[PDB]
Amino acid sequence: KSCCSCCPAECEKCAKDCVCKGGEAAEAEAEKCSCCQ
Ligand SMILES: [Cd+2]
Ligand SMILES: [Cd+2]
Ligand SMILES: [Cd+2]
Ligand SMILES: [Cd+2]
């Protein structure tokens, strides 16, 4: 069970809280996040 579609279900950054409240892309479908890279 995860809390997003850009990180695994064992991410450390997303352990305390989903820190993926970013992404300024309307026509750039990415398969990863910077905050957690
Ligand atoms: Cd994520
Ligand atoms: Cd993460
Ligand atoms: Cd998350
Ligand atoms: Cd992230």
Curated annotation (Swiss-Prot):
A divalent metal cation 5 binds at C4, C6, C7, C20. A divalent metal cation 6 binds at C7, C11, C14, C36. The modification Phosphoserine is found at S2. Residues 1-37 are annotated as: Alpha. GO terms for cellular component: astrocyte end-foot; axon; cytoplasm; cytosol; dendritic spine; extracellular space; inclusion body; microtubule. Abundant in a subset of astrocytes in the normal human brain, but greatly reduced in the Alzheimer disease (AD) brain. Keywords: Acetylation, Copper, Metal-binding, Metal-thiolate cluster, Phosphoprotein, Zinc. A divalent metal cation 7 binds at C20, C33, C35, C36. GO terms for biological process: activation of protein kinase B activity; cellular detoxification; cellular response to cadmium ion; cellular response to copper ion; cellular response to hypoxia; cellular response to oxidative stress; cellular response to reactive oxygen species; cellular response to zinc ion. Coiled coil: none annotated. A divalent metal cation 4 binds at C3, C4, C14, C18. One of its GO terms (molecular function) is cadmium ion binding. Belongs to the metallothionein superfamily. Type 1 family. Binds heavy metals. Contains three zinc and three copper atoms per polypeptide chain and only a negligible amount of cadmium. Inhibits survival and neurite formation of cortical neurons in vitro. This is Metallothionein-3. The chain holds residues 32 to 68 of 68 of the full protein.
